[PDB]
């Protein structure tokens, strides 16, 4: 009895829905530490500290393959870049805040795209 929700849900609507969110959160001025995965060593102990180092390119990687059959994949992973940025990095560095920040802009993008739901 409802039809006002914009939640994509489908793997295709999401794929490219998210393809836009991602594209945005990634195009975000706070997305450069996540725009692409670090050198694995750019970040000292990165893979050690970061049990799951995800990025916007890695995000988009999945995206590309339409992997995001759920905004949660998309949420978790993009959230995996912010959180990993929030995990390892210090809220003093450029990236950490850029994580919270992005995570915020991104939040407006997912929200907008009927994403966020978890």
């Amino acid at each position: 009895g409802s039809h006002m929700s914009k939640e994509p849900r489908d793997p295709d609507q999401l794929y490219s829905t998210l393809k836009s969110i991602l594209q945005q959160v990634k195009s975000h001025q706070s997305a450069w530490p996540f725009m692409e995965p670090v050198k694995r060593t750019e970040a000292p102990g990165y893979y050690e500290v970061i049990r799951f180092p995800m990025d916007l390119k890695t995000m988009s990687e999945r995206l590309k393959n339409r992997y995001y059959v759920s905004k949660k994949l998309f949420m978790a992973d993009l959230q995996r870049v912010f959180t990993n940025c929030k995990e390892y990095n210090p809220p003093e560095s450029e990236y950490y805040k850029c994580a919270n920040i992005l995570e915020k802009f991104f939040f407006s993008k997912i929200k907008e795209a009927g994403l966020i739901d978890k």
Binding site: Y88, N89, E94, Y95
Partner: peptide
């Protein structure tokens, strides 16, 4: 305005 390094942090030495 594009950082190249990963501002080596210290969260889990």
């Amino acid at each position: 305005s594009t950082g190249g390094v990963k501002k080596p942090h210290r969260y889990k030495c």
